[PDB]
From a paper:
Using soluble chitin derivatives as oligoglycosyl donor and oligosaccharides derived from chitin and β-1,3-glucan as acceptors, A. fumigatus Crh enzymes act as transglycosylases for formation of chitin–chitin and chitin–glucan crosslinks both in vitro and in vivo. AfCrh5 adopts the GH16 family β-jelly-roll fold composed of two stacked seven-stranded β-sheets with a convex and a concave face. AfCrh5 shares the general EXDXE active site motif present in most GH16 family enzymes in which the first glutamate, the middle aspartate and the last glutamate act as the catalytic nucleophile, the auxiliary residue, and the general acid/base, respectively. In AfCrh5, Glu119 and Glu123 are predicted to act as the nucleophile and the general acid/base, respectively.
Numbering used by the authors: 24 to 266
The structure:
Amino acid sequence: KCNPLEKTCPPNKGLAASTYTADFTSASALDQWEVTAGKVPVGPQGAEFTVAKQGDAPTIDTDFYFFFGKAEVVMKAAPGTGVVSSIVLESDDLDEVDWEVLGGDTTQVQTNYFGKGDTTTYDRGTYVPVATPQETFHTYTIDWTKDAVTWSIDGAVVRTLTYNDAKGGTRFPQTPMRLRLGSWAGGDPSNPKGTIEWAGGLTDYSAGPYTMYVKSVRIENANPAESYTYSDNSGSWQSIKFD
């Protein structure tokens, strides 16, 4: 939560490899992850993100950050009105690329991005058709280069954000990012009306529980390093130092 746009921050721990793969069949697979809220059991269908009662927001974050490359997640989304299933790439300056599935919307996934925590417009969000994301696994793939972010589902391109498209590159995600996986109630009664409407309605916890499943993760790090340092206030990929 230390923002390098505002302060000098300690370095991000790096994925010092070109490839990271986790089959979530195994208890082992959570080695390089932090269960950063709730409890995330690892059954035969992989890591389980259950929303059972209000305040349930089970999440895992990678210990490491990667700097360009690829994030591929095999996920079956949680069902249920207002239950959100989230795949997030996020940097310490709040550059961000994500997938959002809504439990009651059985025909789409939302694609999204933020540059530097800037939520000013809503040119960031696009819905794409997907067959029953709550009832079947899909492969959600983000290809991330200095030229473009590409979203793919089951190896079909569904969205491309070019560097120029993201306010002339000023809002292009281009700082080292970690992968966050989680489910949560967008339709929590305590949420803003706008979040509940976006989530597709009020969440009924008693009609639960609602479980998102992640069976595997593949990360390709374009720039393997032990760590990344933001050398200035630019938030530019050019400002990122690593050995």
